[PDB]
């Protein structure tokens, strides 16, 4: 019975000069720390136990206590930053890296998990694990001809820990470390386990969340087609990270955006823009807005894939945050589109849902919508149809909303609305 | 750039 | 995703 010990009892055994007594007390600690109901992490720390557990990690002659202390420390490091700091301050990082070479797979697996929790705390501990040299021995655990010969849960823990070494910003991970890890990530992105695939996508989503140079590192490895494939998965835990990565990539250059289009991404958006999960719809529309902010041949691909009606749809009815991203998508479209393309947008029914959003209580969206209108009127000037458009806006309740906005707090608001009235409604 | 980031 | 994981 190593179930239900007190912290006092645990200390009494760990302080005995008896390796087996110490092993029993350490397993008692592990069991305390792995219960679902409020594990006593702070009590264990305050008792002074972390250095003892860390020293046990190196008892190569007694693998069972290696395992139990590894598990106990993993769960202490699963806590707050203060609690994770206590494990790091105990010297655990070099000890856990040594354990990655254990002949016992359940012990090296536990060291992988622990290092994951430590790197997961944030930039500084992530960089400290990398400085202690964790990356080489981690990648060596995956150097096998066929990943399917590894145990499912073992491979899942490795992938998870690798994703945490790619995670966080200010600063982003070291470029040399990212180069070392990317080949393996690419391989894991082609493995058939849903969990490996979700964490592999999260990892790529972290790496692509930066300057164009970071994006380029990823795009150069050729993973965009595989990302678009996973974008079409049925498992929402895969789609979510894959969509986030595609969206990061289209914040880049027009040349990087094009590789996403060339890979087929736009064919998946009819479903993404009608997806029942609000965050999918939000992220798909933000991605669309960064695509309508590209070249005119790229706006044209949006048109050819039949996505303008779906943007009209999201503008008409969706969570407000999604509608806001849809408005951005329209302003970018009208700002960089041809005349023919802006005409098409109007013929798809954009004006009424655009007008209905002017009575929203968000200052920024109103600015966005007014810019878009302005842009459309400019295209109507070029066709000398500014009157037809004025009538249209009048017929759906639009002129009322624009005139009311003239007497509105913000400056850009009253300036832009007053301009429109003077210029097209006189 | 009209492109917006996260 | 899930920053940090406890083993139960």
Numbering used by the authors:
A (entry chain E): 72 to 497
B (entry chain M): 1492 to 1497
C (entry chain C): 1491 to 1498
Authors' text:
In other herpesviruses, the large tegument protein UL36 plays a crucial role in transporting the viral capsid to the host cell’s nuclear pore complex (NPC), mediated by N-terminal nuclear localization signals (NLSs). In this process, one of the seven known isoforms of importin α (IMPα) recognizes and binds to cargo proteins containing a classical nuclear localization signal (cNLS). Structurally, the central region of IMPα contains 10 tandem Armadillo (Arm) repeat motifs, each approximately 42–43 amino acids in length and predominantly composed of hydrophobic residues. The major site, spanning Arm repeats 2 to 4, accommodates residues designated P1 to P5 of the cNLS, while the minor site, located within Arm repeats 6 to 8, binds positions P1′ to P4′.
To explore the molecular mechanisms by which HaHV1 enters the nucleus, we crystallized the NLS of UL36h (residues 1491–1500) in complex with the nuclear import protein mouse IMPα2. Crystals were diffracted at the Australian synchrotron on the MX2 beamline and data collected to 2.6 Å. The protein complex was analyzed using PDBePISA and the interface at the minor site comprises an interface of 608.2 Å 2 mediated by six hydrogen bonds and seven salt bridges, whilst the major site comprises an interface of 779.4 Å 2 and is mediated by fourteen hydrogen bonds and two salt bridges. Within the IMP⍺ major site, HaHV1-NLS Glu1491 interacts with IMP⍺2 Ser234 and forms a salt bridge with Arg238. HaHV1-NLS Lys1494 binds IMP⍺2 residues Asp192, Gly150 and Thr155, forming a salt bridge with Asp192. Finally, HaHV1-NLS Arg1497 binds IMP⍺2 by forming hydrogen bonds with Asn146 and Gln181.
